[PDB]
Amino acid sequence: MKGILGTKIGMTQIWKNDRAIPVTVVLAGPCPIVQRKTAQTDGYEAVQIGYAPKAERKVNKPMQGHFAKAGVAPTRILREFRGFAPDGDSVNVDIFAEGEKIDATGTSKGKGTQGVMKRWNFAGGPASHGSKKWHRRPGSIGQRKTPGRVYKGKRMAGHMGMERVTVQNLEVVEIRAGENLILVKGAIPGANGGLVVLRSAAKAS
């Protein structure tokens, strides 16, 4: 259930009581209702809301029609949250209390096509023990005549990053409400000026 959208603004150092907590600043500027989907309508249980605003000019016709169906003014970005409900339109006050654990999802910083190292944490090769042209290469792909193939999904060089990453149980240090600023304990994946979604934890404990 619980959820809302906002930007990755920055990592910084701040104190509660006596400890250096490291906090990443999210913003969650108000999100508007746009689409309210129920079973008898669209089968499944959800709500689509929106983040960064956009001027009527740079906007499609259809997307205009959409955003006009519930008088809303266009958001550069849309998204869904399963099993929500609210009433009115959606900020972080009413949604998080300070200290509540939360699951924060972003896109990563991606890295391009990456080595067996960087990608998957491969071993390597004896950087000086006679080792011709084998310094960074993963060695063997299989066995031999049996099976005679290479396994499905065998890790090897590949585009690393730009994945969708979720990190679990993060703590709402601080709510600068009506400045729609959120302070969160620790890391949050994907680069500064990021797009992240703070949803309640998946779990319990």
Place this chain on the structure above:
Amino acid sequence: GKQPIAVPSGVTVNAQDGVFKVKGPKGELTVPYNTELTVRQDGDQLLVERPSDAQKHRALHGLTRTLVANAVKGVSDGYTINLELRGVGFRAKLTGKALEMNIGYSHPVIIEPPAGVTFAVPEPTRIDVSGIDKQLVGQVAANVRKVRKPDAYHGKGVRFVGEQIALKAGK
């Protein structure tokens, strides 16, 4: 082998179909019974015969009888099992209906009585499991006892009153 069926004067085992159902005074029942052998009342008594007589027929015979039997003796007499707690201070009570077992375990074990059955206490170091079914009460007392089977050293645990327990004895 077995046949004779002794019904009291306030019974009603409506022997329709295979679902040969009962409604005694101590609360009615519904009892799932074998069709392909058939059974009904013949006046003041009652009877369960069987068709062919290879061997597999000879099972659901004495089976089904002893089952309807269980029904009769249940809607008339009812049922009950005496249980006792033996051991260094073991105790139980009643949360409305739930069984408050306190059996030398760091954190208490309480049990919840399903429908049809009810719980009972006298002096707390004893539990009386009573209900209308005879299966179900067995199928409950089973659990309660299974909270701690009487160990093979001091015999400390849960048991059926008279029940002898043999005692290995250690060092």
Place this chain on the structure above:
Amino acid sequence: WIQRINAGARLHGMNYSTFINGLKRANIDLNRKVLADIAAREPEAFKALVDASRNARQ
């Protein structure tokens, strides 16, 4: 040809084997290629040949 006849037979209540056998019994010495032809392009004819085979069978 065979599967078409089997069909035919069965379309009423006959087996292929039984139809063809009662069409050996009443000695109706038809090629089976023809029998297919009758069966799929000529209805009531197949009907009769059936009634025949069955008659001669019992």
Place this chain on the structure above:
Amino acid sequence: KTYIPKNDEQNWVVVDASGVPLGRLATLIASRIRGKHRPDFTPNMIQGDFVVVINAAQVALTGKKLDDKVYTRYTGYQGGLKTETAREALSKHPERVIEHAVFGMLPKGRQGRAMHTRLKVYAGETHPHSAQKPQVLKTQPL
């Protein structure tokens, strides 16, 4: 010479699978699909009828099978060869048992694959093809 026909018709039915062994209904339907009951039968044409199965939920499987009957779906991936009891697949998604059965009983070339489509699989007593006016087929050996 011999008479090669032309595929008009498109003929529809309702097999009620309630309380029938799998293999049996399996070949009944497999056959109606393949076409073999058409005296104008033709081997490079998919003459066969359209089959609507209701109550694939309530099929009969002879014991103890549904606690013995394995279904093995290999995935390419090591530790793939996953399993499934017949009751599992039945409570999960029963039309995929009936589908699975009928599909072993139809040719494995371009044709057969394409024929699969002539199968419409459900559960309970409901279908959305009332527009196709299906002729209520039965359960016999004829």
Place this chain on the structure above:
RNA sequence: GCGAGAGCUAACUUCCGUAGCCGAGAGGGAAACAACCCAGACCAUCAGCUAAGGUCCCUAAAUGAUCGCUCAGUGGUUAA
């Protein structure tokens, strides 16, 4: 396959004997399969009966008939 020897009453083992087969043999069967079971292909046919082997669907042909057995999926791989 049947006879024996060397072997470990091992071998798709080897060395004799003996029948058939492949070699130099297509055709049907045994899923697939020189050797096995049926059988020796002069051409043509959109013609009929059979063999071994089969007849729920794939796949031609009885989801055959009557007296039975096993309930173990035995069938669909072994022993004290």
Place this chain on the structure above:
RNA sequence: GAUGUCGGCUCGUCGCAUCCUGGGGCUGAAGAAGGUCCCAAGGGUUGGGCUGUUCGCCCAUUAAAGCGGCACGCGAGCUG
């Protein structure tokens, strides 16, 4: 008219006759700690000294420091 061989290194993944971990029966099982057997393959299985070594011995740890298959896995991957 070529199927490159030990050992290391890289990379893996399977078997269960299970080293650990999880569940149970027996106990010559009081407790603690164990013996032994049944179920169990999800994950895990340390760093060094000597020797080309696998192996094995020792140092110091460990819940454990399992056994084997993948052409005694892996040279168009490296060593040599």
Place this chain on the structure above:
RNA sequence: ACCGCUGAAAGCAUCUAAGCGGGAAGCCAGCCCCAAGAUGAGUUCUCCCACUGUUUAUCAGGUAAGACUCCCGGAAGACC
């Protein structure tokens, strides 16, 4: 694996032969990620509309919504 409830064959006893409860780091579900090329191609909101061309020319053309092209860049990326 194992532990039991009701319980006949076998008047007794029996966890089993009909049925029922409990039972693991294992199976399925739950967690993170991909996912309708799921050709069985799903669902929903919104938008443009019903244009023109002697079929001597039974299909093209100009356009709407919208999109590319090209420039400038990027915490996206070898090219795309």
